[PDB]
């Protein structure tokens, strides 16, 4: 049946090899083989061991070239011949990766048939130069109002999501992907971000739940899922971000805008550690090899807003680093912090406090600032930063519980309401056009009066009210994207009208 055609194809692979390089396995163990021979051998080359195991080669020694297996060594055995592929590692890159889960070598692991690939590319590709880069000017809205307001995301920016282990850690990122449904569904290609979610070190069940969640929100019709589950080889895990990067570059190259989530790089470091220490490389600082910074930096620098001569291309990156015990002085967290252009610190205490999404606003920065913040949203959230900063100071004093003066309690009362305003339901991002009103209300102090308990009720109702009456106004906020005097007045009136409900 299908079997007869498959057998025909199999019969159809013949033709002798001339094996211009051979070498005999000898020291093999720990999944890290070392072969003697291979006089010709490119660095980073892919070598097919004769046992159907393929392994890239990362150490060239004047004795034994150290070829890291991509398979298990239970299929390898001593004295095998290895035949050099003659191609440095490469992946199929194409449009067909949209709606596909693929493993590192680009085999569909969701088995939705062979990847429709428009090219192949190479794992290492040098980062966009100074000359082919133009300054960021394109917002990216995550639909998390706190994120948009405090640490605005643009295109070509790298912003590090950092914080304690799996505090819905994946979910913080997933929300961004979900809000990109609004533009993505839309036919504006200048607002189309094709989204690539890279999952390294996670178990197959976790990944499967995620892809299912993405299918539930029917967002998988724009997602590419690059996965390297924890079963899969440490070399494949090490190679996994770099082959994700190339997949992204095909979009970037096409000029199409895209966003790549690299969750979690922390497991890449563990992988590189394993790899290096069984390549017998001298142990690095904190046992992570000392060239991890170079590894991570080269990966991260390949997301950029390419110049207008380069068709305004832009791969955007969001790295995700798990901090083990929240240790921000650990070598791997320190290295990443430097590389990136933002910090999106997530704090466990605030999570428990019920501020979900949980963001310690003091440990969160966007060094690429409000050049990528929506112009309207910049106006409304203008003093939101000041208010929150005042709230933090005030809150510290308030702990001592000394009889606070009215000025301190103006701040305190305002601040409490703001915190409740920020909160949002996980797996349910909100439209930015309808986040601008909520911030206007808060900043123009209308909510400061409104009792803390019923802020949540008020928020829901306010949206309903604006949907009812000021839906002309909402349309304008979307359409004109800057609040003019007329819009500011309309909005002011609307909010005032809704003060008493």
């Amino acid at each position: 049946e299908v079997s007869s055609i498959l057998e025909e194809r199999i019969k159809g692979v013949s033709d002798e090899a001339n094996l211009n390089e051979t070498g005999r396995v000898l020291a093999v163990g720990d999944g890290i083989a070392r072969v003697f021979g291979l006089n010709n051998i490119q660095a980073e080359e892919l070598v097919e061991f004769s046992s159907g195991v393929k392994g890239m080669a990362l150490n060239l020694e004047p004795g034994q070239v150290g070829i890291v297996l991509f398979g298990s060594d239970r299929l390898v055995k001593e004295g095998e011949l290895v035949k050099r592929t003659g191609n440095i590692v490469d992946v199929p890159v194409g449009p067909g990766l949209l709606g596909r889960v693929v493993d590192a070598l680009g085999n569909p692991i969701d088995g939705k048939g062979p990847i429709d690939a428009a090219g192949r590319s190479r794992a290492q590709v040098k980062a966009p130069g100074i000359l082919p880069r133009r300054s960021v000017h394109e917002p990216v809205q995550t639909g998390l109002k706190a994120v948009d307001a405090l640490v605005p995301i643009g295109r070509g920016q790298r912003e590090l999501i950092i914080g304690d282990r799996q505090t819905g850690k994946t979910a913080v990122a997933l929300d961004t992907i979900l809000n990109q449904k609004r533009w993505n569904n839309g036919s504006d290609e200048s607002k189309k971000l094709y989204c690539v979610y890279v999952a390294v070190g996670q178990k197959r069940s976790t990944v499967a739940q995620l892809v299912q969640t993405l299918e539930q929100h029917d967002a998988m019709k724009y997602s590419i899922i690059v996965a390297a589950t924890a079963s899969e080889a440490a070399p494949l895990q090490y190679l996994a971000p770099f082959t994700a990067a190339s997949i992204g570059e095909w979009f970037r190259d096409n000029g199409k805008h895209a966003l790549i989530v690299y969750d979690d790089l922390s497991k890449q470091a563990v992988a590189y550690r394993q790899l290096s220490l069984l390549l017998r490389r001298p142990p690095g600082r904190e046992a992570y090899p000392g060239d991890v910074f170079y590894l991570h930096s080269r990966l991260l620098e390949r997301a950029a807003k390419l110049s207008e001569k380069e068709g305004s291309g832009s791969l955007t990156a969001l790295p995700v680093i798990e901090t083990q015990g929240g240790d921000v002085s650990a070598y791997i967290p320190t290295n990443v912090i430097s590389i990136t252009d933002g910090q999106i610190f997530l704090e466990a205490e605030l999570f428990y406090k019920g501020i979900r999404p949980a963001i310690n606003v003091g440990l969160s920065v966007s060094r690429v600032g409000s050049a990528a913040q929506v112009k309207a949203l910049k106006q409304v959230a203008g003093s939101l930063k000041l208010f929150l900063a005042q709230y933090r100071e005030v809150a510290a004093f308030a702990q001592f519980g000394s009889d606070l003066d009215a000025s301190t309690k103006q701040t305190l009362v305002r601040g409490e309401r703001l915190t409740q305003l920020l909160k949002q339901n996980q797996y349910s991002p909100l439209a930015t056009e309808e986040q601008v009103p909520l911030i206007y209300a808060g900043v123009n102090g209308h909510l400061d009066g409104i009792e803390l308990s019923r802020i949540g009720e008020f928020e829901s109702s306010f949206l309903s009210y604006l949907k009812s009456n000021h839906n002309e106004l909402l349309t304008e906020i979307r359409e004109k994207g800057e609040l003019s005097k007329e819009l500011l007045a309309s909005l002011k009136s609307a909010t005032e009208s809704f003060v008493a409900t």
């Binding site: 498959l6 094996l19 211009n20 051979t22 159907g52 004795g63």
Partner: protein, 187 residues
């Protein structure tokens, strides 16, 4: 300069022996005499096996060396200096190792290509000859180095043949083809 460095540990010793005997001019003589004393070391079974393993003194080692040069008064003087080196480095456990390596350097200097045609069973002499012809015909033979064809029996390599020489092999074994057929027919 040796005819391509090979072997680090022990082979720096071999390299030195080679280049030193290149400056002696007579490398073949050195090798032949070394071969002869090495052979009589192997064909000395009591303590020529059981004192190939260091456990005795530098001075005692020296006196073993003295017994060795009584065993042959033909050993050149460079390979007698090699005896000195090995005694001084007190490494006798790499004497035959060095001998083998010097053989590799020597026959590289002589220029003899090495090869093996591992198969599942010993091949026909017509096959041997045809392969010898083929290998000489092929550009692999530079006309300056003349193959060794060593049949190896490896039933584990189920059927077919694999020709090996240089860093170039052609593996048309049956085992590999079955392996690939099966593997792709598990896909």
């Amino acid at each position: 300069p040796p005819p391509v460095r090979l072997f680090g540990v022990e082979g720096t010793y071999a390299t030195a022996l080679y280049q030193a005997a290149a400056k002696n001019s007579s490398i073949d003589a050195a090798f032949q005499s070394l071969q002869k004393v090495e052979s009589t070391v192997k064909k000395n079974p009591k303590l020529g096996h059981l004192l190939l393993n260091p456990a005795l003194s530098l001075k005692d080692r020296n006196s073993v060396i003295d017994a060795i040069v009584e065993t042959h008064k033909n050993l050149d003087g460079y390979v007698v200096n090699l005896l000195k080196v090995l005694s001084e480095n007190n490494r006798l456990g790499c004497f035959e190792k060095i001998a083998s390596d010097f053989g590799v350097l020597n026959d590289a200097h002589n220029g003899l290509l090495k090869g093996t045609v591992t198969s599942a069973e010993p091949l026909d002499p017509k096959s041997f000859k045809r392969i010898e012809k083929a290998l000489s015909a092929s550009k692999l033979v530079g006309q300056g180095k003349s193959l060794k064809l060593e049949n190896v029996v490896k039933p584990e390599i189920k059927g077919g043949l694999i020709v090996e020489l240089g860093d170039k092999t052609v593996d048309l074994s049956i085992s590999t083809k079955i392996q690939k057929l099966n593997k792709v027919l598990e896909d």
